[PDB]
Design a protein around this motif. Sequence first.
Motif: not given
Lengths: 450, 148, 300
Positions: A354-356, A359, A399, C16, C36, C64, C80, C274
């Motif tokens: 989702a955009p909310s 992560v 990461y 998104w 995306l 996002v 992201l 969204w």
Amino acid sequence: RDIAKGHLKKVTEQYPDDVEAWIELAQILEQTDIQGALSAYGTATRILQEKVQADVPPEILNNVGALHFRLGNLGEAKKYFLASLDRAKAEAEHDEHYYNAISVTTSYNLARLYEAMCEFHEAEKLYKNILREHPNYVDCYLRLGAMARDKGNFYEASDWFKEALQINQDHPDAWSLIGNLHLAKQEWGPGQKKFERILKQPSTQSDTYSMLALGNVWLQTLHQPTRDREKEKRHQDRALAIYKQVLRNDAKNLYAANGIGAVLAHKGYFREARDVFAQVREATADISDVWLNLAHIYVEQKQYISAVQMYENCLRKFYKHQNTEVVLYLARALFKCGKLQECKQTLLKARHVAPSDTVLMFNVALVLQRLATSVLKDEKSNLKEVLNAVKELELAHRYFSYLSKLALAATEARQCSDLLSQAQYHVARARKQDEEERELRAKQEQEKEL
Amino acid sequence: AGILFEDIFDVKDIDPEGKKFDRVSRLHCESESFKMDLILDVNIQIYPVDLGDKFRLVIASTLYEDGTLDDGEYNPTDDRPSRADQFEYVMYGKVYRIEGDETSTEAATRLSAYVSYGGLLMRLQGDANNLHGFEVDSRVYLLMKKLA
Amino acid sequence: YGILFKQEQAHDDAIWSVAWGTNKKENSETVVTGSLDDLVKVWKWRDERLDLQWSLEGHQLGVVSVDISHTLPIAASSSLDAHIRLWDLENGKQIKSIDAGPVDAWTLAFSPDSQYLATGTHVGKVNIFGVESGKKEYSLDTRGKFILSIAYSPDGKYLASGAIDGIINIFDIATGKLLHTLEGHAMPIRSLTFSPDSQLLVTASDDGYIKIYDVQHANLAGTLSGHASWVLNVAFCPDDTHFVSSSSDKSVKVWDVGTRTCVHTFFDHQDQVWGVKYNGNGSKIVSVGDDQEIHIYDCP
């Protein structure tokens, strides 16, 4: 009731205007049947409105309202509940309704619709009106506690359950609600206390939730690193015995069979437990636990395709609501044998939530996906995708900087410098192949000019 | 073992354009699990079936859990553990056609296996991942079972 | 109220976010979408249809959040990989890239004067970057958990921040002082915005409600019964008459807040919606979701 339904069909075959037979069928459906009675909800309804034109009793209108509430026609159900108070004169207009049965049960039913449609103020007002008509009926307090729990106010839900217990001390429903509130908070001590308080008088479909919760609290520690110590005490044999004692009584509660299947799956008997997963699979649907057990059985068997299909079916029939952890459980089963040859499409699916959201949690799995990209970039020697994947490899090392804070850091600390040292000459290999392809296209253009 | 396909289907419809043969009827059905389509010819006399009924299919390559792939020969007496003992309706045929959603460049997404059990036809139409082990001119067993 | 145009295959993957300007400074014809498929696409809305203006390819992960400046014809997008990119919408070229990595960057918001760019981080702070250079001018520390949504007032007065544990913080953007801390949410708040006069704060949270707070004295101004699921995006019409909401139950709803009634509900999306935003003239609604479509709904 089978002979009663037979006699009702005989009465309907001997006279089609049996108002008492239709009222009996509507009541017997409203009390028990949901699945099959709905077409019979038509059958009682169509004649009963023909009675409702002749005379307006509150019983027939209330039965039509309950049948519409159970069928899923909330509008006509609410209209019949309102007609039971407005058109049925015998309820409270110029007569008296016994035990407050006519209005307050209606004050339950549309109020449950107030629970259903997110009409919390109207449902609260209906529960307050039911409490004002009679101080008893703690079940309205239980519905208020469940509504307060749905708001994210489980303390208020516990207070409403305490008010329901003040209405009736020996009430297994409020005790089961308090036990579920404790079990959600990891309160197995208080859960066992509530089960002991419930198990004094009660049993039989109000104690089996407690046995299931005891087996679930054993399985919750079976899935953790303390399960060796619980393996020292043989908690799984106790859970299996509890599941056998629960299954000896029930014949339609598939949660006990699913628990027994899970307990068989957690030991070496999983090759039979999947067959138990067959039997619950033969049972009725709309249960995500069966598909989740089949996915877990496929993941334990290393058959990732069938587990992925089961997870996809579970997400297709459940993803409407708070199932944002099931995507991580799908993605966790793709690296159970050191597999990185099936995590190419998983790179977009695992980060597609989702955009909310956060992560930080699944970064390790993200690294285990990017390494798969780091497998392919070394094989494909075509330019305009190599160095972009090297930039994504540097991002995967960033990461890894969080993955370090545990032998996975020891693996990827080798892999970072190893993949960078491979990329050092693989980018020159890619540019060499670019030069060769440009040589070929130049030769073809020269042939065309010739 | 050897199991080509395994699903529970639900009769959405019976033979739409009337019935052409008085003993055997083309039933149409969908799937819950895999969401694919089936058209099948069962004979009504020895195995009746109604609309809205629900049953389970196991399309398999052999009738033995040993996976021996024995013959196309009929022996009435065989003292072996058979897969057909668990199931009500059993047929035997050869798959004769496989049709695909394929094109010139890309591979196929959807497949359609067509198989004749002695004259009784069947179309199984889903996706290429589930319709995997079907190969043309392979002998095959049907294995239905009706469940409540 | 109805559907005017649907743009199918606007992206190859799920969309998104969407943004639309408010003033007539070349952002009242511009759609900016983040999707995306690692792309930012700028669309030109003109002559009752939607046309592609730019396909901006700078991101290596899914975008996002997108936002458009209300004082400049520029946009910014955050993805992201925590790489923020500013795009000049008069040449379709990259202004700057703020590597706010490794993962510590989130949804963006422009100030109405477009001097400051606000974003949330994993520490629990609100970083305020300068738009003139792309360097972090200051931070706002309101300790706790991850900030999911942030929003400026459209008159240059206050900043609102919504966290994942339901903590709302109201800031004065002239001195950086924390003015108010609001907690009526134990659930994540995925969208909030100030009214076009800075009088109301409408908050969309993951609890099935649309909650209205007064940010002049910090009390509960009201609770609108929203969808039955997570309300994902709320947006005001720029004359403060109606507001639109979208949810994960595949539903868009236009709400009249004066009567507290839904005046129209759109089911045209068959996926989770969204992003929603009103037109600068206020006669159009742009909405995006996981259905790969950009839906334009008309308004009287």
